């Protein structure tokens, strides 16, 4: 009998969503000129990982980047000169995510091992060692990202996100609500809100302070793999196994535009925006990335450079570069 | 500025030395994914051979790391994709259950036709054969009730039954093996193959079996790349 009012209230919510929908992001945007024909080529190709890369994260200085590979390596690259800076050997070789702290002092990584390891890069001695291991999740960690040096947000395969105070080591907050594996995590520029996409084809917005989900977004047809806020933080984009990306705005609480093609039939693995938010970059399972005009939903370019599955994709804060890591163990920088 | 660049190049050299030193080690060992149900005796086999339960066994100067994934939740659609590069999947089945056997077949079928898990060979162990023989002799539970097609199955001429084994036990055994191999050969495309084995809980010759299957897998990989097979 409870499902009855649940269902009717969902109907009321859907009716409100339909009422709030007057115009789509297709007629309003059609008036502006098309973005063009963006062609990019590999400025730098970083080589050194033995196995396939899963994740990577730029620095805030747009210089350095960490990358995680299944041989158990967390390798920091200097992007301009292709030199390595650090090569950290992991306790567990099944790392599915990594983060580079915004202050640049710390790196995080975790995966099937169920623990998020945090490493400091600027010890007095000089070497890089285990700063602290955070445990408490009962599933693989799909993503982790830093609020600051002393507070990190993680998302696990046990349908839960966790906000950790690093000094004490305990999960300050436990965000619950998702039905399936939480696969991706993206944080707002204000570091007060963050969206998380899971396998139940749902993305949930969380307030870090409140500890309870503020809004929920559905519209996909399969598992969500990647998610990313629009640069201003009033929207975000998600990629799934549907071979479709979608853009959701927080205030409108409704899907705005979907990016999909008849030809494309493989799922999205990674999604990132540009500095301006005009170009949405999505890595697909067909071994190459596609660049969409985020406004007109056209296909603006193609980063066809990788031999295997494109796993991770990221864009510098400066906006000068795009890193793409794939399952053929090669990082590529595009411009 | 020259000093900084020289120091950076020195650091990159000292790092690349370590990666060169570790690449040999990484290429030497072979990684194996151990899958099986709770009922299936994968725990006992890994215990006899010896979050994520990693074990390592060394035979004939070759090292294998078996990675039983135990800490995760029921769903495996996403964590499985981590094992595209393993040499083999060791898939263990409790063959004396008769009720959770179609579960095993469904899982094997899902593994076989996975896009990422394709081109991966499966070494299939059919554990608890003692219990299956005891059950078939007992005759309390009839297999046909669970698998109708077994009412017309015939033991094939290529079968090699153990001495002093009743024809009933052989017939049931090879029925189960054929149930798996139908799925295996339905869509293989020659990239990967299934290697079925008949093992007991008091069997101590498993490690050599995995070594033999891994050698065969790597031999086939080399032969196909040289286009000799």
């Amino acid at each position, epitope marked *: 009998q409870l499902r009855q009012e649940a269902e009717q209230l969902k109907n009321q919510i859907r009716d409100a969503r339909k009422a709030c929908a007057d115009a789509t992001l297709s007629q309003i945007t059609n008036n502006i000129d098309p973005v063009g024909r963006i062609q990019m080529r590999t400025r730098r190709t970083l080589r050194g990982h033995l196995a396939k890369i899963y994740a990577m994260h730029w620095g805030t200085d747009s210089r350095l980047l960490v990358s995680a590979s299944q041989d158990g390596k967390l390798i920091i690259w200097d992007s301009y000169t292709t030199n390595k800076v650090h090569a950290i050997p992991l306790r567990s070789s099944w790392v599915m995510t990594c983060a580079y702290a915004p202050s640049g002092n710390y790196v995080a990584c975790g995966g099937l091992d169920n623990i998020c390891s945090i490493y400091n890069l600027k010890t007095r001695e000089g070497n890089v060692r285990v700063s602290r291991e955070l445990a408490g999740h009962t599933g693989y960690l799909s993503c982790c990202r830093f609020l600051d040096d002393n507070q990190i947000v993680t998302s696990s395969g046990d349908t839960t996100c966790a906000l950790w105070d690093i000094e004490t080591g305990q999960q300050t907050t436990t965000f619950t609500g998702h*039905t399936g594996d939480v696969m991706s995590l993206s944080l707002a520029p204000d570091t007060r809100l963050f969206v998380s996409g899971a396998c139940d084809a749902s993305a949930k917005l969380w307030d870090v302070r409140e500890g309870m989900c503020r809004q929920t977004f559905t519209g996909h*047809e399969s598992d969500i793999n990647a998610i990313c806020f629009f640069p201003n933080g009033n929207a975000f984009a998600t990629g799934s196994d549907d071979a479709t990306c979608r853009l959701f705005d927080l205030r409108a609480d409704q899907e705005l535009m979907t990016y999909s093609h008849d030809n494309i039939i493989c799922g999205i693995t990674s999604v990132s925006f540009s500095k301006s938010g005009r170009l949405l970059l999505a890595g697909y399972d067909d071994f190459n990335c596609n660049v969409w005009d985020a406004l007109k939903a056209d296909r603006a370019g193609v980063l066809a450079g990788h031999d295997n599955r494109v796993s991770c994709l990221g864009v510098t804060d400066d906006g000068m570069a795009v890193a793409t890591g794939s399952w053929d163990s090669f990082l590529k920088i595009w411009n | 500025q020259r000093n900084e660049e020289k120091a950076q190049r020195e650091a990159n050299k000292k790092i690349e030395k370590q990666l060169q030193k570790d690449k040999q080690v990484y290429r030497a060992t072979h990684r194996l994914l151990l899958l099986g149900a709770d009922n299936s005796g994968k725990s006992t086999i890994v215990k006899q051979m010896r979050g994520i339960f990693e074990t390592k066994f060394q035979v004939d100067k070759v090292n294998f790391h078996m990675f039983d994934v135990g800490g995760q*939740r029921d769903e495996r659609r996403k964590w499985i994709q981590c094992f595209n590069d393993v040499t083999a999947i060791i898939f263990v089945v409790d063959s004396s259950d008769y009720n959770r056997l179609q579960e095993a077949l469904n899982l094997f079928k899902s593994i*076989w*036709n996975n896009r990422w898990l394709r081109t991966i060979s499966v070494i299939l162990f059919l554990n608890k054969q003692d219990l299956l023989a005891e059950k078939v002799l007992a005759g309390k539970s009839k297999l046909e009730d669970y698998f109708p097609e077994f009412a017309r199955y015939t033991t094939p001429e290529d079968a090699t039954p153990e001495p002093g084994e009743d024809p009933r036990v052989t017939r049931a055994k090879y029925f189960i093996r054929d149930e798996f191999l139908r799925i295996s050969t339905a869509s293989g495309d020659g990239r990967h193959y299934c290697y079925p084995h008949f093992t007991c809980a008091v069997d101590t010759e498993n490690a050599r079996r995995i070594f033999n299957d891994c050698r065969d897998i790597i031999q086939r990989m080399h032969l196909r790349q040289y286009e000799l097979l």
Partner: nanobody
Amino acid sequence: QVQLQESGGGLVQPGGSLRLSCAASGFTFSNYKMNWVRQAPGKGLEWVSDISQSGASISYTGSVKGRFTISRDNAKNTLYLQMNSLKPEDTAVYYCARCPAPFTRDCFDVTSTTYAYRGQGTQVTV
């Protein structure tokens, strides 16, 4: 969103007949292999049948083979299971399930305890 709604079933005497229906919404029904599973009272989730995208390849669990018929109609986006000659080990809650991803012929986690793409199911008792 992805919504699977089951219908049909009830109390039928042994040797009777039933027709289980599944209405799908929120996804392209034509592109996913669809399954039927059952939850027996006090037992675990058991896969019962599956049918491929176009219905070319249909499969059943050995127990129910020969008396259940699976089908799908993509015009009205519906899945059907015809139940014939019921016996009192067939009583269960029947769940319609959708395969995790499109354009695939493997289907993982369909019998998982908290799968995300199954309906509420219907009680079929005899």
